[PDB]
Amino acid sequence: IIGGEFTTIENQPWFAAIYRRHRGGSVTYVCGGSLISPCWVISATHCFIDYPKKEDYIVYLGRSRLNSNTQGEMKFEVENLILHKDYSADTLAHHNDIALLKIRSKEGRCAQPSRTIQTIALPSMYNDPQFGTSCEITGFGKEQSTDYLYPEQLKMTVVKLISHRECQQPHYYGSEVTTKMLCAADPQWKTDSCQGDSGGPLVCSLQGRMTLTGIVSWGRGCALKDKPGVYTRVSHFLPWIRSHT
């Protein structure tokens, strides 16, 4: 997250931190995710496509820090890694960028809700907030493009949803952004998601309910003028999510 605010997991209790174990025992951070039911975390296919081996991955819930323990945190393995069959990537745009991770503890249990671990509501069909709506994003991704390490503390920021018409302008993304994608950015281009935030939530208060409207997917650079963050439009994928869970 470029700019924005340091946060803690109680403020973002659906947030899932996903890491990959390497041969030799080193563990690196991959991407964010969101808990949509006790056994299911939703993320982005692009985070796993090149290493699609579910045994490699560790998922934490209730975690506020990248490489230290948070009280109440819970550690999981991936029982099922489900990537979208029609995923593809162009030069900038990623398509069908959505993935589900069925999580289980070493004892075979799913998440136990607490003050720091909660599910986030899915949106209803064809129901997204109006452009101009302010929504939040959360993640452990880069704070500046010159960063070679991720921040140790979780971050969040607030961005505004941008219309499809605006996002398809020639100086934005033209026809590379589709109706299955949502653009969001800061009017001053000072805050944005960045590399490492992918897979994480774009949450909007929708009819008084905190809703998983988007999943961090792609964008040109980070907090670059006329280059919004692009998010998987979760509301388009409800049948896929329902069939695979």
Binding site: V30, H46, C47, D50, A89, S193, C194, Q195, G196, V230
Partner: peptide
């Protein structure tokens, strides 16, 4: 991998 932005996390060269 590559450090070319959102979309490119955890990628493999070749």
């Amino acid at each position: 991998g590559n450090a070319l932005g959102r979309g490119c996390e955890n990628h493999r060269c070749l």
